[PDB]
Design an enzyme around this catalytic site. Structure first.
Site, PDB file in Angstrom:
ATOM      1  N   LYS A  72     -10.309  30.144  46.135  1.00  0.00           N
ATOM      2  CA  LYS A  72     -11.527  30.482  45.285  1.00  0.00           C
ATOM      3  C   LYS A  72     -12.859  30.185  46.325  1.00  0.00           C
ATOM      4  O   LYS A  72     -13.585  29.651  45.692  1.00  0.00           O
ATOM      5  CB  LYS A  72     -12.123  30.159  43.981  1.00  0.00           C
ATOM      6  CG  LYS A  72     -10.701  30.716  42.868  1.00  0.00           C
ATOM      7  CD  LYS A  72     -11.127  32.303  42.552  1.00  0.00           C
ATOM      8  CE  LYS A  72     -10.430  32.637  41.298  1.00  0.00           C
ATOM      9  NZ  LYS A  72     -10.654  31.836  40.141  1.00  0.00           N
ATOM     10  N   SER A 258     -16.573  28.021  46.239  1.00  0.00           N
ATOM     11  CA  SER A 258     -17.369  28.678  45.235  1.00  0.00           C
ATOM     12  C   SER A 258     -18.291  27.562  44.228  1.00  0.00           C
ATOM     13  O   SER A 258     -19.405  27.802  43.935  1.00  0.00           O
ATOM     14  CB  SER A 258     -16.746  29.582  44.155  1.00  0.00           C
ATOM     15  OG  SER A 258     -16.396  30.831  44.691  1.00  0.00           O
TER      16      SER A 258
END
Ligand SMILES: *[C@@H]1O[C@H](CO)[C@@H](O)[C@H](O)[C@H]1NC(C)=O
Ligand SMILES: [Fe+3]
Ligand SMILES: [Zn+2]
EC number: 3.4.21.-
Lengths: 331, 109
Positions: A72, A258
Site C-alpha cells: 500500500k 500511505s
C-alpha cells in the site's frame, strides 16, 4: 532508525551515487538523505512497507505492484521529462524495429523480441497487453509467460523465470548467472539495454520508451535506419512517435508509505535537491546524471525535475484509469 | 573486479552495509523457520542501533546549527543575545565535531 529520509538503492552503482547525494546535501546545508541497499524494486517496496526505508523511484509497472497489499505505497512525486520550457509528465511506450523489413504489429508471431524487463510498462505491460488477443492464452493454471514464450520464437525478458521459461531468456547477453538478470549485470536490461538487443541484430522488435532511440543515437542518419510500429499496422519514422505509439503512460514516480510515509520530508528533499543539483545547476554533483557505463541511477538521466503528486491520489489514480484497467485486464 | 577502500570505509558506507547484513540475516532466518544466527543478529542489530542514534544526532545538530547561523545572519537587531547565539553556534559545532569522531570510532566495533 533515524528520523531523516532514507532512500532505496537497487544496486551497488546506485548506492554509490546515493552516497554522493548524501555528501553533497550535507555540504550545501540542505535536507539529509541516507541510503538503504537492496537488490530489486520488490525488495525496496518491501523495505519501505516494513519501515526500513522511506523512498524509491519505480516504473509504472512497479507503482502498480507497490499499491497492492500488504504494501500500500503511493506515488508522492513524479519525474518530469522533456525540456524546461516544454515539460512532460507522461511518456510514450513504442515498438522499435529495423528499417527494411515489412512486418507489422499484427505480424510479430515467430519473431525475436527485446523487452526492458518483466512487468515493466513499455517493455511488458504495454506490448503484452497489446498482443494478448494473438497469444491464444487460456489463463491459470497457465502463466502468461508461457503463451508469450510460444508466441515469439525467442526473446530477452530480464527477470523472467529462467527455469520454466528458458525461451524468454535465450536472447539475453548476460554472462553465466547474470543472464536474464533484472539488473545492469544483464547488458540488455532496461530501456537502453533492450534497444541494444535490437541494435546488435539479436532481436527484431524493441519494446521501449519514445526517447530512448534519441538518447542512444546522436546522428540523424543512424536514426533514419530505424522505424516504429503503429497500432494501425503501419510503419513510421521514429520522430513521428505521437502518431505512432502503443500507449501514453504517466512517468516514473517516487513512492512512499500511505501512512507515516514522511511525504513532506521527501518532497522537501526533492525540491531542494532539484534547485541545487538539477539540470545545469552544479558542476559538483548531478541528481539526474549517471557516470559513464551506468544508466538512470535513482532517477531517469533525461529527467529535468519533479512534480508533486496531490494528496488524495493513490497508485491506481496516479496510473490513470486506462493503464490501471489494462494491467488488471492483463492479469 | 575493483574498489577504492576510503569510499568503503567512510561511516556512511559502513552503516549501509551493516543494515544490509541485518536484512540478509533475518531473511536467511526466515528461510529456516519454514538459533546461533540469532545471537549474531542480535549483536549486529545492537551495533546498528548505536550507529543510527549517532547519525540522527549528527542530522539533528546540522539543522540546529543551520537555523542558528540564519538567526545570527540577521544582525542589525541586543548585543548579548547576539553573543548568546555566537556561543551556542560554537558549542553545537564542538558537539558535532565530537559526535562525528564518536561515529568514526564506533564504526569499527
Ligand atoms: C493462435 O491461433 C492462430 C489462429 O488459429 C494461429 O495462426 C497461431 O499460430 C496461434 N498462436 C500460437 C500462440 O500458437
Ligand atoms: Fe518505464
Ligand atoms: Zn580493499
Amino acid at each position: 532508525r533515524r528520523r531523516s529520509v532514507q532512500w532505496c538503492a537497487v544496486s551497488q552503482p546506485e548506492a554509490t551515487k546515493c552516497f554522493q547525494w548524501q555528501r553533497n546535501m550535507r555540504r550545501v546545508r540542505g535536507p539529509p538523505v541516507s541510503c538503504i541497499k537492496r537488490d530489486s524494486p520488490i525488495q525496496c517496496i518491501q523495505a519501505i512497507a516494513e519501515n526500513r526505508a522511506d523512498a524509491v523511484t519505480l516504473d509504472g509497472g512497479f507503482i502498480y505492484e507497490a499499491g497492492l497489499a500488504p504494501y500500500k505505497l503511493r506515488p508522492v512525486a513524479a519525474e518530469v521529462y522533456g525540456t524546461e520550457r516544454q515539460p512532460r509528465t507522461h511518456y510514450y511506450a513504442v515498438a522499435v524495429v529495423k528499417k527494411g523489413g515489412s512486418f507489422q504489429l499484427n505480424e510479430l508471431q515467430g519473431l525475436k523480441s527485446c523487452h526492458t524487463g518483466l512487468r515493466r510498462t513499455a517493455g511488458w505491460n504495454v506490448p503484452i497487453g497489446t498482443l494478448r488477443p494473438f497469444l491464444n492464452w487460456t489463463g491459470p493454471p497457465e502463466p502468461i509467460e508461457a503463451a508469450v514464450a510460444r508466441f515469439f520464437s525467442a526473446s530477452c525478458v530480464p527477470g523472467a523465470d529462467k527455469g520454466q521459461f528458458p525461451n524468454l531468456c535465450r536472447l539475453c547477453a548476460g554472462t553465466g548467472e547474470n543472464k536474464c538478470a533484472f539488473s545492469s549485470q544483464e547488458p540488455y536490461f532496461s530501456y537502453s539495454g533492450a534497444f541494444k538487443c535490437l541494435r546488435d541484430g539479436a532481436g527484431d522488435v524493441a519494446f521501449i520508451r519514445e526517447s530512448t532511440v534519441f538518447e542512444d543515437l546522436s546522428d540523424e542518419a543512424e536514426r533514419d535506419e530505424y522505424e516504429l510500429l503503429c497500432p494501425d499496422n503501419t510503419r513510421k519514422p521514429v520522430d513521428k512517435f505521437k502518431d505512432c505509439h502503443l500507449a501514453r503512460v504517466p512517468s516514473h514516480a517516487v513512492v512512499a508509505r500511505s501512512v507515516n510515509g514522511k511525504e513532506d520530508a521527501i518532497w522537501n528533499l526533492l525540491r531542494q535537491a532539484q534547485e541545487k543539483f538539477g539540470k545545469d545547476k552544479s558542476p559538483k554533483f548531478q541528481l539526474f546524471g549517471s557516470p559513464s557505463g551506468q544508466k538512470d541511477l535513482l532517477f531517469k538521466d533525461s529527467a529535468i525535475g519533479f512534480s508533486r503528486v496531490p494528496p488524495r491520489i493513490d497508485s491506481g489514480l496516479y496510473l490513470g484509469s486506462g493503464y490501471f484497467t489494462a494491467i488488471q485486464n492483463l492479469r | 573486479g575493483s574498489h577504492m577502500d576510503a569510499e568503503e570505509v567512510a561511516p556512511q558506507a559502513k552503516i549501509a552495509e551493516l543494515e544490509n547484513q541485518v536484512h540478509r540475516l533475518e531473511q536467511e532466518l526466515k528461510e529456516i523457520d519454514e538459533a546461533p544466527l540469532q545471537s549474531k543478529l542480535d549483536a549486529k542489530k545492537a551495533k546498528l542501533s548505536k550507529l543510527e542514534e549517532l547519525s540522527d544526532k549528527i542530522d539533528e545538530l546540522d539543522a540546529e546549527i543551520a537555523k542558528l547561523e540564519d538567526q545570527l545572519k540577521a544582525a542589525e537587531e541586543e548585543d548579548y543575545f547576539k553573543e548568546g547565539l555566537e556561543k551556542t553556534i560554537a558549542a553545537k559545532k564542538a558537539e558535532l565535531e565530537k559526535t562525528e569522531a564518536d561515529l568514526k570510532k564506533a564504526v569499527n566495533e
